[PDB]
Amino acid sequence: MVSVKPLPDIDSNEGETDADVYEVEDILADRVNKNGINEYYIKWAGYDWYDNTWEPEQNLFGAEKVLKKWKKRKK
Amino acid sequence: ARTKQTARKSTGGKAPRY
């Protein structure tokens, strides 16, 4: 075998993470699984207008402001 | 810029079926 260590393949600098982050226009509705995962109907901006889909809260780590706003106004 | 929020979007997945 060869003995090599990992490289900094992932950037450590903060900047453009668009590849793993899309805009949250706002929440359109919500849902919860039986497995214990909560999901919301997100309108992702930056993408096509018809792209909106349900995503878990887990991906909404940045959209807590908008999500919690939703959950505040709607249960 | 417009002050707005963003989130991941799990872009990728596979349904385990045969």
Experimental technique of record: NMR
Q: Provide the CB-side half-sphere exposure for B6 (13 A, CA).
A: 14
CATH number assigned to the domain covering A1-75: 2.40.50.40
3-state helix, strand, coil in chain A (%, to 5): 20, 30, 50
Q: Which residues pair with A53 in a beta bridge?
A: A42
Rounded CA-CA distance A31/A23 in Å is: 20
Q: What is the 3-state secondary structure (H, E, C) of A12-33?
A: CCCCCCHHHCEEEEEEEEEEEC
Residue A70 near residue A47 (C-beta atoms within 8 A): no
Q: How far apart are CA B11 and CA A55, in angstroms?
A: 10
B-chain residues near A63 (CB < 8 A): 5-7
What is the rounded CA–CA span in Å between residue A60 and residue A73? 17
The CA distance from A59 to A17, in Å, is 14
CA distance linking residue A24 with residue A70, whole number of Å: 12
**B5 with A44: Cβ contact below 8 A:** no
Which candidate from A55, A56, A62 shows the least CB-CB separation from B5? A62
